[PDB]
Amino acid sequence: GVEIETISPGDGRTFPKKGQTCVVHYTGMLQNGKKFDSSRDRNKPFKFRIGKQEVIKGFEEGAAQMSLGQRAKLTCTPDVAYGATGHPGVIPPNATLIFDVELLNLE
């Protein structure tokens, strides 16, 4: 269940394809609103190649749905992201996550 609220309009010229690395600055928060992770604080773009299982399924699906230069409100169900088991100390069990991603470039 990826319902992307288009925060900023995307270019629409290109979309992610298998074998291409994706560059994002994903800001994350829980359903209650508290922030758990913000790559922006690290100040380093997160790089991952689409197609493999490097990232969670929900993030990959949202990136595939998203376009270059588009900011979207990424909502993930507990089934697609973590679930009954999660990262100990960070993500509570069976809790939804609300990601905020934006694609600087697609490579």
Binding site: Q31, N32, K34, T96
Partner: protein, 259 residues
């Protein structure tokens, strides 16, 4: 302390009601911890375990006029400290959402103060109870064993604190009776995570009455944001621009939304 025939309770007594020196000013009460609804929603042992409805009762002591006692729930974002307070004076707003054709598909109302007037309901003490269901998203107000027509619906995720606004009218003013209805899990179960499935009503030391102080101290920020303003356009109107960024590091109390 909890009695055999009476659940544990907190009572408020005026120290010097008889003395003329003591003031009779307006005062507000707010319990220490909140009650939180689920992020998303739809005496018998089974019903009790699955019950999503909680109950607290407040007993107005004899000799206190019910007209001055306002009982209900309070949103944490509450800052009204009016000397003379009325439910009509409560700030409220209704948000209506429609489609392109103008059809109203969703309509919601949100306010920072959800209470009913004691005088609106009505020399014997009357107990005013509030039934809240977490999974229902709405609450029912049953006072003195009789249900009331008025009721409210809340947002999916919001915080709510028990609260009563009472004007001093007697030496013994009011009582917070934390008790559970036969089929209603007591407020203590939803109050703490550990006692979620505990039917027995308990009053841990954390819960306490927090009155509304009018003025509290605060620290001035060392550097403020620089903002410039001028009427830069004869037809472009006034313009404002800020360039220097500034950030501040703060802590969040999870019990009450504050920084």
């Amino acid at each position: 302390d909890g009695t055999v025939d009476t659940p544990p309770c907190l009572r408020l007594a005026h120290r010097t009601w008889g003395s003329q020196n003591s003031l009779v000013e307006m005062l507000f009460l707010r319990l220490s911890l909140p009650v939180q609804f689920h992020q998303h929603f739809r005496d018998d042992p089974e019903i009790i375990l699955n019950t999503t409805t909680y109950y607290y009762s407040v007993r107005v002591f004899a000799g206190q006029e019910p007209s001055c006692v306002w009982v209900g729930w309070v949103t944490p974002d509450y800052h009204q400290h009016d000397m003379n307070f009325d439910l009509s004076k409560v700030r409220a707003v209704t948000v209506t959402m429609g489609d392109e054709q103008g059809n109203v598909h969703s309509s919601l109302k949100c306010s920072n103060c959800y209470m009913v007037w004691g005088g609106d309901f009505v020399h014997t003490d009357l107990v005013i109870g509030c039934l809240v269901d977490l999974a229902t998203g709405l609450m029912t107000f049953t006072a003195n064993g009789k249900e009331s027509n008025t009721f409210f619906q809340v947002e999916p995720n919001t915080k709510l604190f028990p609260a009563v606004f009472v004007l001093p009218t007697h030496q013994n003013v009011i009582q917070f009776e934390l008790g559970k209805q036969k089929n209603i899990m007591p407020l203590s179960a939803a109050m703490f995570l550990s006692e979620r499935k505990n039917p027995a009503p308990q009053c841990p030391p954390r819960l306490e009455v927090q009155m509304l102080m009018p003025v509290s101290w605060s620290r001035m920020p060392n550097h403020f944001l620089q903002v410039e303003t001028r009427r830069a356009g004869e037809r472009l109107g006034w313009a404002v621009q800020c360039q220097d960024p500034l950030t501040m590091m703060a802590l969040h109390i999870p019990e009450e939304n504050r920084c």
